Design a protein around this ligand. Structure first.
Ligand SMILES: C[C@@H]1O[C@@H](O[C@@H]2[C@@H](O[C@H]3O[C@H](CO)[C@H](O)[C@H](O)[C@H]3O)[C@@H](O)[C@@H](CO)O[C@@H]2O)[C@@H](O)[C@H](O)[C@@H]1O
Lengths: 306, 309
């Protein structure tokens, strides 16, 4: 079977940067910021990039055991691998795969099973991926919990992400910052083996973003989350692994209700999408609409305005 | 004849996801299932890509709930009147047992409720647990109740989401008596009959048992039974749905291959109605190479004799 994209509606698909479903399509200018997400990065021939991995549910999860920090409700987690094996920090990846690729305060729950009797406990925890001690690359991250005693040492402990939070004493929606990369090895360290930043070069083109709204758990957070590729596309390319004939796969978005092509876009072989539009726009689509790969084209093909 | 050739994805067990809870697959397990009914509504799909029961494509959506909430005064418990997944009105005339991705087992599912106030975008998040065994658990009728850690914080008439994390045990001193993964909830509440169910599955061929794709649900309190078995990995459901390869016969013969040795560890029967059986007798945890994966080799008849594993 030749190269293609799956027949999945936007709503039927999942965000590749957080374990939540896609809601809509959004385009806007990106010269004011850097677009360098590490999750949801995959070439059209199925080469995973950055911290990208196949499991949607594992995105922004952490695993390991925890050590309580006295005089606080904070626990340091010495990370294990996703399969509960030892973590190796010599792997040529920016951070353990599925690590958050944005600076924010991610709230969820820590859970733990005592091996001997199978007793369990669960508590609310938040991780500040902006914090100097956020060093998943070195196998350590800290969690702000509401307990100073319940978690036992040397037991398997999991973090399941739920949403994000904001400090309401400050300017609203100032956090999280989705386009700011964390320092995976902690403050004053340089990230390594990154998926490259993407920017539109062709005139009149903006990125097409696959947008979700992260749940907010406290305050006034910026809950917009844009991924370059839906998680399903990442899984699909990895499975198909169809080599790219050219730099760009021309895609058409089809409307089943009318039968006509609503808009067309450029799927770049390194794994991102551009459309011909100028300004901030939320795309209004038929909910049963879907993408279809029509042709291999070069980078400087001229898209019809949308 | 000459129809599109059926296949399964080249995915390791570890690379895949549980179809009954938003967690990764860990292991393969086989055991006897004559003592109970195997009738999960999640992770049900024919090999030709027809979704069954409460099954839907997104793993993250499994065991989630959406809607607005009404406080029960003088308590930390909230009733949720369910909305659709895309925040539209819930429709109870749909020919489905329950809202898609609804939990298909009786248990106490703990996670977090989150809510956004539309006017100013203020947000709140609290730990909540839902008892799918409870008499008032009627997701089919657009209602679920949550035991929360707040007695005031949630506003009415705002979009509210439940994100599942794991399961809990309590109300008893007996360990691992709950949850009960093979007990279907009464989707319309107690003393009501479930409808449009995916059918129960049982091994028919002599000496054969079901093959289970097993995960360990996180435990958030007490001593719960955290074993979770799905008939189909979520990715297989996603795969079959996309490919929609017609079934030549009742059964697709699968071989589990070891890349390290190059040989076949074991073979199994993938029934076109969407479940797997192997030739083994008794409870068994499969010891597999972590890079091992399934491969469809041939269509065989229903009464084919599997190599013992
Ligand atoms: C914007 C505000 O955010 C959330 O509240 C937290 C505060 O939490 C506390 O007060 C809220 C009610 O406002 C509620 O009683 C909660 O149980 C309690 O912890 C507090 O953590 C501050 C600290 O700066 O941050 C937020 O204001 C949320 O619960 C509120 O509903 C509201 O959205």
């Amino acid at each position: 079977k030749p190269f293609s994209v799956p027949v999945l509606t936007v709503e039927e698909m999942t965000n590749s940067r957080f374990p939540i479903p896609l809601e809509k399509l959004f385009t806007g200018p990106s010269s004011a910021f850097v677009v360098q997400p590490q999750n949801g990065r995959c070439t059209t021939d199925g080469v995973l990039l950055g911290t990208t991995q196949l499991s949607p549910v594992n995105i922004c999860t952490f695993r390991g055991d925890v050590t309580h920090i006295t005089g606080s409700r904070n626990y340091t987690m010495n990370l294990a691998s996703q399969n509960w094996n030892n973590y190796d920090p010599t792997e040529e990846i920016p951070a353990p795969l599925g690590a958050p690729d944005f600076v924010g305060k991610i709230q969820g729950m820590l859970t733990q099973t005592t091996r001997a009797d199978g007793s369990t406990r669960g508590h609310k925890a938040t991780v500040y991926t902006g914090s100097a001690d956020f060093a998943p690359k070195l196998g350590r991250v800290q969690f702000e919990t509401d307990t100073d005693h319940d978690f036992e040492a040397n037991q398997n402990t999991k973090f399941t992400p739920v949403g994000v939070i904001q400090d309401g004493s400050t300017t609203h929606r100032n956090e999280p910052q989705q386009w700011v990369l964390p320092s995976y090895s902690g403050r004053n360290t340089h990230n390594v083996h990154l998926a490259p930043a993407v920017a539109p070069t062709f005139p009149g083109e903006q990125l097409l973003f696959f947008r979700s709204t992260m749940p907010g758990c406290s305050g006034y957070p910026n809950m917009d989350l844009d991924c370059l590729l839906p998680q399903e596309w990442v899984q699909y390319f990895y499975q198909e692994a169809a080599p790219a004939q050219s730099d760009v796969a021309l895609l058409r978005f089809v409307n089943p209700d009318t039968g006509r092509v609503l808009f067309e876009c450029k799927l770049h072989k390194s794994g991102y999408v551009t459309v011909a539009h100028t300004g901030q726009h939320d795309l209004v689509i038929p909910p049963n609409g879907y993408f279809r790969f029509d042709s291999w084209v070069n980078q400087f093909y001229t898209l019809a305005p949308m």
